Design a protein around this ligand. Structure first.
Ligand code: HEM
Length: 528
């Protein structure tokens, strides 16, 4: 008789359902908890899986320690498990592959194996709009990047430089944070000034004068509203009926409506030049199967592009100011380079002269090493992946995480990695360089290997295309800061630690510096 056991199964299930409610809820908690611990122990027996970081709370996983201190998390995990390990994160299993072989595994993964859009779309599509970036197939994305790269040529940068410079000078002249014609010293929060300087400079050069003019009005607040939908909370809860979710949606419609108004206006008057990225996309937005981008998709793409440059660049110029505030030796060395390359300030800044300022560009390069703004990049695994030279298979449904910014801070590859030293890039001041062979995924030839330990712009098919614009924007900005101001910390303040909980690895605020005019009597012209 084992039927008698089957009877007591049914009886036991019957008594379960009749349990007092305090015992039921108590069982609703402890049973997943116990089963979770039981499941991790069994999982650790598989030799075709990377080790899984142990965790107590089901579903939540290591979310708290990963979210607050991801590089300390990766360091402890690397010590216990080596370079490949998994961890549970708010319902998803993330497989991390640290170091240059990790860069190869994730950035050069076959298009069939992994998907960036399946990882990112739920966050970006409500902010940018439909049909662009991650709300479309990869081949569309490749061509959208090709279209945008067409306003990111050397000739475009040659004309952007005086525009960016003018925006910087107007901001020194007009912003409450400076007012250089009335004040010779002052205190600023770089997390206030740098997001504003970034949007002004990128709008004026990428979007044009009209969109720049609209930033002088209350329209400028729509970018802040749009910004607030770009939070890690939208990573797990992409649609909650709360108020900031609808200010995001409203801002996306109002901003893209403004871009579309300008677009349809320029087509109506045949006023399509080579001024800005709007002109460029109006003349160059037809895919290779004949389909043209709609005016809505062009506007959504312009949002994406500005947004992709907004927080990365603002973060980096904040960190450059913060590192230089305790390094008056570096400020003095950069000042001397400015005086030699620009003939005591007599020469006007041009894109070509920016290329003759190695120490300035090394400063950007070194800030991008220490403060990579995206600590983790993600893909969702679409087919089972064997990791080379191991027995591991990463099953479809997992995510892979790569973190070049973690490698940037490893002493093995950058001696004394937590020291800020622009001279470690002596003789190698280029934003990056294909160290050999190349490959074209649709938006131009880029490095084929991605094993460099230094990868601030990623690699492979999802590689950044804003790198030269970022260097051009940061280079003009810092050139002018250095020629105009010295700055330092208030007594007892130093370089703040990064805040890893936001989209980018921002300084913990308020990160304040004190500035003073190098030439207290110098006046910025124009009208205000
Ligand atoms: C300091 C400045 C910047 C840094 C450090 C940076 C970093 C990155 C990284 C690491 C990626 C790859 C993401 C991944 O592989 O998952 C990326 C992609 C991208 N970024 Fe940048 N970026 C910067 C500035 C910009 C600017 C100024 C723009 C636009 C003008 C831009 C637009 C893009 C675009 C279009 C992509 C392609 C995304 C894809 O193909 O999936 N970025 N960026």
């Amino acid at each position: 008789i084992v039927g008698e056991a089957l009877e007591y199964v049914n009886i036991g299930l019957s008594h379960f359902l009749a349990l007092p409610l305090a015992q039921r809820i108590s069982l609703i908690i402890i049973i997943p908890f116990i089963y979770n611990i039981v499941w991790q122990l069994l999982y650790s027996l598989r030799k075709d899986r990377p080790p899984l970081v142990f965790y107590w709370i089901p579903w939540v996983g290591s979310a708290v320690v990963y979210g607050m201190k991801p590089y300390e998390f990766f360091e402890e995990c690397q010590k216990k498990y080596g370079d490949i390990f998994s961890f549970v994160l708010l319902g998803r299993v993330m497989t991390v592959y640290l170091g240059p072989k990790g860069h190869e595994f994730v950035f050069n993964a076959k298009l069939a194996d992994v998907s960036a859009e399946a990882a990112y779309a739920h966050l970006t599509t409500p902010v940018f709009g439909k049909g662009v970036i991650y709300d479309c197939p990869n081949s569309r994305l490749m061509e959208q990047k090709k279209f945008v790269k067409g306003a990111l040529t050397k000739e475009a940068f040659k004309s952007y430089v005086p525009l960016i410079a003018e925006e910087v000078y107007k901001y020194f002249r007009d912003s409450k944070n400076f007012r250089l014609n009335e004040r010779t010293t002052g205190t600023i929060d770089v997390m206030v000034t740098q997001p504003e300087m970034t949007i002004f400079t990128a709008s004026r050069s990428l979007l044009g004068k009209e969109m720049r003019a609209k930033l002088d009005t209350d329209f400028a607040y729509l970018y802040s509203d749009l910004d607030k939908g770009f939070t890690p909370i939208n990573f797990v809860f992409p649609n909650l009926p709360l108020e900031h979710y609808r200010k995001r949606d409203h801002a996306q419609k109002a901003i893209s409506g403004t871009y579309m108004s300008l677009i349809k206006e320029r087509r109506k008057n045949n006023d399509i030049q080579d001024r800005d990225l709007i002109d460029s996309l109006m003349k160059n937005s037809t895919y290779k199967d004949g389909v043209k981008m709609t005016d809505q998709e062009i506007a959504n793409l312009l949002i994406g592009v500005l947004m992709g440059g907004q927080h990365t660049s603002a973060a980096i110029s904040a960190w450059i100011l913060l590192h230089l505030a305790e390094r008056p030796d570096v400020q003095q060395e950069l000042y001397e380079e400015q005086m030699r390359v620009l003939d005591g300030g007599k020469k006007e800044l041009t894109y070509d002269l920016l290329q003759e300022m190695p120490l300035l560009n090394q400063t950007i390069k070194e800030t991008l090493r220490m403060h990579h703004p995206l600590h983790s990049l993600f893909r969702k695994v679409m087919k089972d992946m064997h990791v080379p030279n191991t027995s591991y298979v990463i099953p479809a449904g997992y995510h892979v995480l790569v973190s070049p910014g973690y490698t940037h801070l490893r002493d093995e590859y950058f001696p004394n990695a937590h020291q800020f030293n622009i001279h470690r890039w002596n003789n190698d001041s280029a934003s990056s360089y294909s160290v050999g062979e190349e490959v074209d995924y649709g938006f131009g030839a880029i490095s084929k290997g991605v094993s460099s330990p230094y990868l601030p712009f990623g690699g492979g098919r999802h590689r950044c295309i804003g790198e030269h614009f970022a260097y051009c924007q940061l280079g003009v900005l810092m050139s002018i800061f250095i020629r105009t101001l010295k700055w330092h910390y208030p007594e007892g303040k130093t370089v703040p630690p990064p805040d890893f909980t936001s989209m980018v690895t921002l300084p913990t605020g308020p990160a304040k510096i004190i500035w003073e005019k190098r030439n207290p009597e110098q006046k910025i012209g124009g009208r205000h």
